[PDB]
Amino acid sequence: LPVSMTKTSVDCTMYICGDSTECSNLLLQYGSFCTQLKRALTGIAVEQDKNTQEVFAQVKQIYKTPPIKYFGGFNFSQILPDPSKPSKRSFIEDLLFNKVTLADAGFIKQRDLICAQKFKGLTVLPPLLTDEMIAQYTSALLAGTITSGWTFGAGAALQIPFAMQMAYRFNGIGVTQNVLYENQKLIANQFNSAIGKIQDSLSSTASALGKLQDVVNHNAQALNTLVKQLSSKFGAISSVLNDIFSRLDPPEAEVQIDRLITGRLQSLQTYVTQQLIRAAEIRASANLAATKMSECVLGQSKRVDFCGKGYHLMSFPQSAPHGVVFLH
Amino acid sequence: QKLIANQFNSAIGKIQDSLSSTASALGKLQDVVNHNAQALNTLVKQLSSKFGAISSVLNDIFSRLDPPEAEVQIDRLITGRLQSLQTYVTQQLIRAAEIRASANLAATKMSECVLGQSKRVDFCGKGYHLMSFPQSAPHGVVFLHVTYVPAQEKNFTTAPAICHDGKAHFPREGVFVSNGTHWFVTQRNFYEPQIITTDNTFVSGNCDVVIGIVNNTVYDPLQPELDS
Amino acid sequence: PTWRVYSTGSNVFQTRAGCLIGAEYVNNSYECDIPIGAGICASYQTQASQSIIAYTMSLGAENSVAYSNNSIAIPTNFTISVTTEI
Ligand SMILES: *[C@@H]1O[C@H](CO)[C@@H](O[C@@H]2O[C@H](CO)[C@@H](O)[C@H](O)[C@H]2NC(C)=O)[C@H](O)[C@H]1NC(C)=O
Ligand SMILES: *[C@@H]1O[C@H](CO)[C@@H](O[C@@H]2O[C@H](CO)[C@@H](O)[C@H](O)[C@H]2NC(C)=O)[C@H](O)[C@H]1NC(C)=O
Ligand SMILES: *[C@@H]1O[C@H](CO)[C@@H](O)[C@H](O)[C@H]1NC(C)=O
Ligand SMILES: *[C@@H]1O[C@H](CO)[C@@H](O)[C@H](O)[C@H]1NC(C)=O
Ligand SMILES: *[C@@H]1O[C@H](CO)[C@@H](O)[C@H](O)[C@H]1NC(C)=O
């Protein structure tokens, strides 16, 4: 499920004009068009941080895992963070990160890439939460729900063995406790066989993370449409302002360099309009993902087809680029 | 009863203290009025714009230039005054979607926490939900979520089963706890130790398949009533 | 020589969101007061004089749960709490 969106800032003067022309004196006759768009863009830029704070910051206490990792025969080595890595991610998280090809332009570094849209006034702001911090929020959420169950989401963290925790979770769907206490090895082997198939079904088929690629590529498409509309005329003689200024006669330029200005204002308004439209979908997806975390990870839900297909027992979230992955 | 009533009264009396302080508690209701005022202020502040024409006053242009040369500046002002209003209507229809998505969530929370009790965690407040009280607010609603928060936990020794006579005993609605010497049964969310009784536990299988089974005596509530 | 008219500077810092000028970076960690970007937040704290400081945001409290295979935690009391929701 997607969670966040690429925060984009737009330099209005560098997009409409070319930062080397007397166009900036003609843009002041409109006044408040370059401020409303950047205000609406700052609203999206703080909304995509609020959407991450509403999903991943559900607990205010970072829980840790014990050094001896015995949980009644269950193996969580593929979902726990690997300490022999600089990113300190899980064995599923490093495969989820390597399958989402990001194309953002938020950096400091300087044949050119697709991030040449910075030179036209279209920059990318970095998110507030680093991916290492998201991977540690994920680690705290796993260390709470493994060593405590659902007690860390309602009050203080109460310790419980994982065999008794799953025996408690069998009672939520109508199954008695004697099924696990007579068949613990079969449940442990089925869980360790179903966990290892997740990395096999994720590294294959090449289209598992389509919902994250569909929100990564759409921002780049909306940016490349905004840049490719700059090389247009809107019914004038040329697209380069430095040719119309250095060729035509001053009082007949207030129509040919008015058509380009109105066209570039309409393109910016269109870009802000479709981004404000598609941000309500990412906000709805984040409001659904936070409810899914609270009802499947922080507790046990009895809702059908809300925490997977079947009778829900527990869930495990994994950190994803611009989203989250649930292991139901 | 008196402790729960005093805790509820002390938690209700702190709501008015937490609401009258910090000066920014009702931000979600102030931001809607701030946006609806900023849009209405921007719609008037763009009437003083010329959009590349001679002047922003219409009666100057209709009494200044030619009966058919003023119709290219008036048509320039009209195609910006109909664009600002279209942008205002588009942004209002965008904000109306978020307002409707918040109102549907508010109605769902009202029906699922005020009109009843919900088992959805963190939907009717943080903790085990008990009650919820609505309050009339300007352009919104305020829910006072009464929740159950456990506190003052203690450490005990647990066991999956109790072996009395070669049979495995499992708790019906409780859990086997130990205070160091004896073994008791209590509920999961509150410490209330009771004796191991055949009415509190049920029998299923032997003591050879259950891992971690311990040895204790399961008290029969019939055998003292048979010797006497 | 710049479109910006003035120029200010007290202390420079290399943040991933850009060059932060006017805040001193400390090795401590607190709650995020003013978000800057990429795990860096700014606040107004004293240390006597008051100044704008830069820091990495606090993830929360660290609490290692004493988990074992033969221990349970049962609460003995409770607390009735009322939480507002606007
Ligand atoms: C949990 O599962 C992982 C694999 O999913 C196990 O790691 C394997 O350990 C064997 C040792 O016999 C190695 O040969 C494999 O290469 C390991 N696999 C990977 C992917 O690293 C691990 O032993 C299991 N148990 C625990 C307690 O972690
Ligand atoms: C564990 O609990 C049992 C019973 O709840 C305690 O046994 C009681 O101890 C007190 C004082 O030590 C005596 O006055 C009672 O007569 C005992 N009752 C029974 C039924 O034996 C026991 O002391 C507790 N142990 C610990 C370490 O707290
Ligand atoms: C800034 O410049 C210095 C030297 O020019 C360089 O070493 C450093 O890597 C640059 N910063 C970034 C974030 O690349
Ligand atoms: C419990 O008692 C049975 C029979 O007295 C014995 O076989 C078993 O080993 C005992 N278990 C433990 C843990 O002492
Ligand atoms: C139970 O836990 C102890 C310490 O926590 C450990 O030494 C022991 O090996 C565990 N039992 C099993 C069967 O692994």
Residue numbers in the entry:
A (entry chain B): 724 to 833, 844 to 1061
B (entry chain A): 917 to 1144
C (entry chain A): 628 to 674, 685 to 723
Q: What does the paper behind this entry write?
A:
pmcThe Omicron variant of SARS-CoV-2, the causative virus of COVID-19, was initially reported from South Africa in November 2021, and quickly became the dominant strain worldwide. Compared to the original wildtype (WT) strain of SARS-CoV-2, Omicron has 60 amino acid mutations, of which 37 mutations are in the spike protein, the target of most COVID-19 vaccines and therapeutic antibodies. 15 mutations are in the RBD, which contains the ACE2 binding site as well as the epitopes for 90% of antibodies induced by infection or vaccination. We report the structures of the Omicron spike trimer on its own or in complex with ACE2 or an anti-Omicron antibody.
